[PDB]
Amino acid sequence: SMVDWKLMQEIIEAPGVSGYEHLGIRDIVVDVLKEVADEVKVDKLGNVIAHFKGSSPRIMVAAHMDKIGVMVNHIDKDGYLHIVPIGGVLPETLVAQRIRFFTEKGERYGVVGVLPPHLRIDWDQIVVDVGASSKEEAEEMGFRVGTVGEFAPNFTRLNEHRFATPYLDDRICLYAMIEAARQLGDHEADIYIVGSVQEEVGLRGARVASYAINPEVGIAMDVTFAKQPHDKGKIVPELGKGPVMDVGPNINPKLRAFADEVAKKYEIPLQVEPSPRPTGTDANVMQINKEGVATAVLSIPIRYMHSQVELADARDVDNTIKLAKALLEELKPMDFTP
Amino acid sequence: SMVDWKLMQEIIEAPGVSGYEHLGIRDIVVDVLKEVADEVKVDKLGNVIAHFKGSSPRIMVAAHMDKIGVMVNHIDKDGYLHIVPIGGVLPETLVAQRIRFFTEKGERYGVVGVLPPHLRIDWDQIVVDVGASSKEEAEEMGFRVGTVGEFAPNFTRLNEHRFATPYLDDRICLYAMIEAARQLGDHEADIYIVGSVQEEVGLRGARVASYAINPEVGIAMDVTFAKQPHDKGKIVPELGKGPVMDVGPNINPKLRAFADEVAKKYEIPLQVEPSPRPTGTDANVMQINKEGVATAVLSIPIRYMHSQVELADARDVDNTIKLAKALLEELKPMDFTP
Amino acid sequence: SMVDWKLMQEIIEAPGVSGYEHLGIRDIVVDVLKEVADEVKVDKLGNVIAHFKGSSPRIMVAAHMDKIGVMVNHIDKDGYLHIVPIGGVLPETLVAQRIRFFTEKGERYGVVGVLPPHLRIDWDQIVVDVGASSKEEAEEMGFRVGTVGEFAPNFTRLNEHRFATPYLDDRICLYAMIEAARQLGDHEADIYIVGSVQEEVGLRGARVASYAINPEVGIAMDVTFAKQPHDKGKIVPELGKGPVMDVGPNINPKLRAFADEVAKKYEIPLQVEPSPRPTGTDANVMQINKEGVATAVLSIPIRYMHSQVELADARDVDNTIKLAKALLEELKPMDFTP
Ligand SMILES: [Cl-]
Ligand SMILES: [Cl-]
Ligand SMILES: [Cl-]
Ligand SMILES: [Cl-]
Ligand SMILES: [Cl-]
Ligand SMILES: [Cl-]
Ligand SMILES: [Zn+2]
Ligand SMILES: [Zn+2]
Ligand SMILES: [Zn+2]
Ligand SMILES: [Zn+2]
Ligand SMILES: [Zn+2]
Ligand SMILES: [Zn+2]
């Protein structure tokens, strides 16, 4: 298990909003997995699919490579950018923030300004300043209709265990899945490790990857909500209390019971999240793939999801790596029929 | 046809909310169908698929086994449960009601309390009392994060024909489909009778069952809205006027015309429901399965859908059994191209 | 003391809304009291007055036989009932509930329906379905202008001590008073045990019973509010902490002090409720009867008053039986002058 802070930060900060995972994260995932997998391929949507050959059952584990972000809708006559969200970016988190754009002339920053109080929440109030003085100048700088951008990186390690940064969702789980894969010992299962694309715009990469792989078992590794201020006591998982595994309709009872047994065997703390609906993770589309798949969700709890200050606890990451590795190594043929 | 009140009530009251159909209803459906079907199997999502071997066309008929219900989100320090809905349960129907929970220690009841007027619609106002005095006590009683519950059974036969009970949706149609199956005589069609899972959380079981079966023809048997107080005259079907079959984009014109001819031949009253959108039934996902399926919806009209007092007329149930049996027996190869 | 669950449930479920206590509860109260009382009579309003002859002081103990309920205002052309409340029934507790009506053709049920969300708290939204299709049919079924109904029975024992059911108010105290009466040993006081009528519509039976009895001392046994969710910490009594006895203007200080001494002597836990106003119980009218009466209130705490899920703790019922018996046996001439 054990957290490699340098690799983890590299995986978090690599470029790749939904539909543009090829801008950086994809090559990193391919390179790290090619060293340990029997075969790694990239499909037409950009999913990275790494095969660790085994016997049975066939399992697909998916963590998504894409980040939420923004796209330039148009550039105005004074050289300001008007942007729209890619995935669940909320306008409130954009005020007085830096955005990292992927322009024709490399990575370039812009800022979302604020109007001083004496001149006075929605997308129309959001205008990006890139230091340009005209539309022509912004265009010469490399900005275009369709230019995409991300929250600017800011990795903050607060103490021994806690850290805050944009894009723990889902780079922290992609990191954990990749570490589990690198540490993977012998296993009976036929394992596909998938870096999925476009999770944040409707689970689109995992949909096609599941179709091609045709797994019997599916596990999505995505982040989940942790107890935090103003949550009204409604959130069950807490930072530092371990990986989280949902229960509910998206979650095969036999697979979820198997996961409990494994967690107990390896003495890994395991939290329960009640999910009464099909989840908002790749496991949603994996479960209803083709003839149906036995699915579960394995999550790292974070605070402040979908903002620049997503915050996690490295003890949870470590234990998630350990649990993913143990599930993959312990998995064996069994009857998943509910 | 003919209504078997005892079997019908047993099928209505068997446990099984979305994702937990294995708690009771599934075994009943398997047992009754195994007696008449050539083969019955349960898939990975829990669908019951019973094959009545025939020639052509291949038809799938689906009625869903799952009920809407609730799930325990957390237990508070005073031993009260805080719940969230599974499917379309509305908070208004929970006030001063009993809930039947499926705990580690068998079935146990709780009540949703009301606040006396002198101390004064949303989920936060909903708190379940299970007779416990602390979190530890509620847990010893068997309640957990993730415990599921249902409207408590209350079967009320009002007169010769009308009756009200929780969960006519969709146990009344599952009952009707099962009776039609038991009475099924010779048939040319290759018939799959499916007890589907997770209809109430997005048609998920019928999606995978349709994929595996690959039918040419699909019929969903689900309940529909009947004329009732305060409906502003907008609902077409009425209690006691027979089974209902939609018309609209989800409904293959040739199959629907065939259904009219059959209803006329057997002198079965048949109501028309205008459905301008893809339906909220299993026929939605059956129609867009693989290369496409000729689909129709065959419904029993009920009042007060998704509440504890869903109300139907046994004459409609009888006629639905008769019509389902006749469609299956009359179905023959034909061109379904619109 | 000791709770007889079978008798208690029978007393709770016997028919009898305000003004219609003769439909069942009255005969039960008469029959049980006739076995132990020197004389039992029923007055013109329907009060049951049982005399246990003694010396002094003359005491009247009253628990009310009436339930809150509903009455049919009119039947509409489609056979639905439109109802109005008898006593403090709130429209919110009627949604998707069953009502037990007392018709010309025996007990018959109806349901209060709900309007599905896509077609959208006050009495005009409340319409009762009885399975009829026309006004004439509902009338043939026995429904009339003036037909009365009750919350349908649903007795739920949650565990060893806690239980929830419609109509703990005031059948639980009527049960406790009746058990105390049956266990009553020697006593100096001249005791009248009264099953009062029409408490829920303005304390009307206790008014005339007090006039006829002319007691020197009066105790009302009615339920009171217990700590429960969303009460904002404003309710003092709690389930399981014993009978409750108010303090305040309705409560004679000498009698209330005597009650404390008795509770201490018999080691019965006794809660205090602050009541700054004349109470909403029979003790209100007893106190201002004729030349004035020394009065107190002895209550069983319940949650969710006036709803179908009123919830109590059998330890409190037991201790209330014990305290009532001890007060009656210990009572002796004393000066009640404040
Ligand atoms: Cl996500
Ligand atoms: Cl294959
Ligand atoms: Cl439905
Ligand atoms: Cl085929
Ligand atoms: Cl009262
Ligand atoms: Cl006198
Ligand atoms: Zn996300
Ligand atoms: Zn994510
Ligand atoms: Zn439904
Ligand atoms: Zn349905
Ligand atoms: Zn009352
Ligand atoms: Zn009362």
XYZ file of N, CA, C and O and ligand atoms in Angstrom, chain C residues 64 169-170 199-200 222-223 280 305-306, ligand 12:
41
model
N -61.328 9.503 29.795
C -62.386 9.604 28.790
C -62.470 8.434 27.818
O -61.458 7.885 27.387
N -54.724 7.837 23.419
C -55.527 8.914 23.976
C -57.011 8.597 23.743
O -57.467 8.654 22.599
N -57.774 8.246 24.783
C -57.328 8.133 26.174
C -57.568 6.706 26.670
O -57.714 6.454 27.865
N -64.918 14.161 25.941
C -63.789 14.969 26.385
C -63.180 15.705 25.192
O -62.762 16.860 25.318
N -63.137 15.053 24.030
C -62.376 15.590 22.904
C -63.092 16.729 22.193
O -62.501 17.394 21.334
N -55.568 11.322 31.879
C -55.528 11.551 30.440
C -54.069 11.419 30.027
O -53.193 11.405 30.877
N -53.791 11.324 28.736
C -52.398 11.227 28.321
C -51.777 12.613 28.272
O -52.484 13.614 28.251
N -56.201 20.964 29.417
C -57.124 20.474 28.408
C -57.539 19.056 28.748
O -57.453 18.157 27.915
N -49.200 12.458 19.911
C -50.616 12.566 20.287
C -51.521 12.950 19.120
O -51.161 13.772 18.278
N -52.708 12.350 19.112
C -53.740 12.579 18.111
C -53.374 12.102 16.721
O -53.805 12.684 15.736
Zn -57.331 12.692 26.095
